Amino acid sequence: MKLTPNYYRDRVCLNVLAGSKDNARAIYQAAEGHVLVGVLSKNYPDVDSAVKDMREYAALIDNALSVGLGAGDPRQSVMVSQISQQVQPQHVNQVFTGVGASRALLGQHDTVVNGLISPTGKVGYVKISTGPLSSQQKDAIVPVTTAIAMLKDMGGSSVKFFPMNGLDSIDEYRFVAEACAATGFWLEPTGGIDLDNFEQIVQIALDAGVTKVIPHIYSSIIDSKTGNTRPEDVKTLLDIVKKIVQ
Amino acid sequence: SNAMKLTPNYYRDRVCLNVLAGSKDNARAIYQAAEGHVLVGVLSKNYPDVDSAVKDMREYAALIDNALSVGLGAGDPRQSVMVSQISQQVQPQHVNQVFTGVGASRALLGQHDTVVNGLISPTGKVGYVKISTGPLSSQQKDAIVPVTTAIAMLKDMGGSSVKFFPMNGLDSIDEYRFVAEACAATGFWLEPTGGIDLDNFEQIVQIALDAGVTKVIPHIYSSIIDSKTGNTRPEDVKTLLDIVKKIVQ
Ligand SMILES: [Br-]
Ligand SMILES: [Br-]
Ligand SMILES: [K+]
Numbered sequence A: 001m002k003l004t005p006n007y008y009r010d011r012v013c014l015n016v017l018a019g020s021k022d023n024a025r026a027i028y029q030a031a032e033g034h035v036l037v038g039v040l041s042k043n044y045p046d047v048d049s050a051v052k053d054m055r056e057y058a059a060l061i062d063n064a065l066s067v068g069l070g071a072g073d074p075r076q077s078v079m080v081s082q083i084s085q086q087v088q089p090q091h092v093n094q095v096f097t098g099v100g101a102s103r104a105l106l107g108q109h110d111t112v113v114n115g116l117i118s119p120t121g122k123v124g125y126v127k128i129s130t131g132p133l134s135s136q137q138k139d140a141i142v143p144v145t146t147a148i149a150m151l152k153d154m155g156g157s158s159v160k161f162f163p164m165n166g167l168d169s170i171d172e173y174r175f176v177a178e179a180c181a182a183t184g185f186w187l188e189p190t191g192g193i194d195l196d197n198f199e200q201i202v203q204i205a206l207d208a209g210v211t212k213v214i215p216h217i218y219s220s221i222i223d224s225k226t227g228n229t230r231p232e233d234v235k236t237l238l239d240i241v242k243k244i245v246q
Numbered sequence B: 001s002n003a004m005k006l007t008p009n010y011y012r013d014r015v016c017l018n019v020l021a022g023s024k025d026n027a028r029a030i031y032q033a034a035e036g037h038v039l040v041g042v043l044s045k046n047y048p049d050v051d052s053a054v055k056d057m058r059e060y061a062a063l064i065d066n067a068l069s070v071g072l073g074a075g076d077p078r079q080s081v082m083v084s085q086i087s088q089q090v091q092p093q094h095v096n097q098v099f100t101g102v103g104a105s106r107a108l109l110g111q112h113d114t115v116v117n118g119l120i121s122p123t124g125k126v127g128y129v130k131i132s133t134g135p136l137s138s139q140q141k142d143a144i145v146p147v148t149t150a151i152a153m154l155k156d157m158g159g160s161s162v163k164f165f166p167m168n169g170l171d172s173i174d175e176y177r178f179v180a181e182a183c184a185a186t187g188f189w190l191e192p193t194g195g196i197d198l199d200n201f202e203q204i205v206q207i208a209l210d211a212g213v214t215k216v217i218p219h220i221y222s223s224i225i226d227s228k229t230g231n232t233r234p235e236d237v238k239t240l241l242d243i244v245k246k247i248v249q
Helices: A021-030 A047-060 A074-087 A096-106 A144-153 A170-183 A198-208 A231-244 B024-033 B050-063 B077-090 B099-109 B147-156 B173-186 B201-211 B234-247
Strands: A014-017 A035-040 A065-068 A112-119 A125-127 A141-143 A158-161 A186-189 B017-020 B038-043 B068-071 B115-120 B128-130 B144-146 B161-164 B189-192
Touching: A014 A231, A021 A035, A021 A047, A021 A231, A035 A047, A047 A065, A047 A074, A065 A074, A074 A096, A096 A112, A096 A144, A112 A144, A125 A144, A141 A144, A144 A158, A144 A170, A158 A170, A170 A186, A170 A198, A170 B201, A186 A198, A198 A231, A198 B173, B017 B234, B024 B038, B024 B050, B024 B234, B038 B050, B050 B068, B050 B077, B068 B077, B077 B099, B099 B115, B099 B147, B115 B147, B128 B147, B144 B147, B147 B161, B147 B173, B161 B173, B173 B189, B173 B201, B189 B201, B201 B234
Parallel strands: A014 A035, A035 A065, A112 A158, A158 A186, B017 B038, B038 B068, B115 B161, B161 B189
Antiparallel strands: A112 A125, A125 A141, B128 B144
């Protein structure tokens, strides 16, 4: 079963949450396969139960599975590394201090492992103290290029730039995308992305020269009555992707 | 194919050299010296017909695990149709074409793995490239078009990369840089060609990598060829490899 995401035209793959197993199947079909379906470690009492249920999801969607911390929660980073070791998904969400352990325990470099780093309000400078203890200490704020080189040194695949707050951090995001393009590194914009800002946010990464972009799109496409990601919103997003990835 | 690989062996999925062979033994030595991260050019113009070119190029391919680049011969557009016919039969990793030969070559290849470049040229004007590089069109008034539009036409024709030629080394640096940023933006690949030597190679490749170009196939020809033998110097290929390993990180 494949360990790399199904990028559309090798450039863009959606990342969205599933509300259930049936929703995961529908999302996977709506995206024509060009999606990673997020399942949260935080929903299981232990590693064994999470691994079991995630392999059930993986089987429905040809392994197009993204293992989630749950809202970037660093307290889930160890459990994510353990779950991902057994599940061998296509995608893993990590915080900056959990990238090395996750890569090492996966035992291969095909699974995409992202590394959560955060806007600071100043272009070119990012917060990287995003682990469970380090997130409680004075912030570690470093140059974007150096943060990327450190993620690469630790075996990471991509930056998760979070929380973006939609377009509120757009100049910082653009500088990160330009730095990713220059280093061969991939990019996952996350936080407040929706049907109105998604095209611009992806277009900025594309125009900067980012090789692979994995946007995450969550509450803005989720039906609150069922907790499901709406398949019609996934198609709307896939149409945008086909329009701008040529 | 006969299960031979149809895509170049890029080093870390980013950069693959392209250099000419002066003989079969030379092709083997080059392939060794590059640790396989090379496409070895053999030229259609060196053969009297399609069948003989196919036969001979199949022999080269066998020595080098298909790491063969079918050449026009110094981008000569009169060889364009023969390159399309040769490439159909040989199924190499790489094909050099002029802009007006990309669609026929891709169609006769019958698959999209083999890399097919399309020759487009500096104009002196950043953002604008000459695309009338086929046998008849090269003799008419230049067709000059926006870089982004030339890339989109190459994609529409089945092409994989821009061959930007003649670069004259660093002489067209501002134009080259623009092309590199436009390829990175559009997910398209780039093959800088013309006047590259061991002293400007790093800077020329670094420009493409800093722009974010996903695959870069630089061409390095007479500056590394021993004119006494016609053979590409395997030690010059090693020096190139070492730069690639330094900068592709
Ligand atoms: Br997460
Ligand atoms: Br040529
Ligand atoms: K760029």
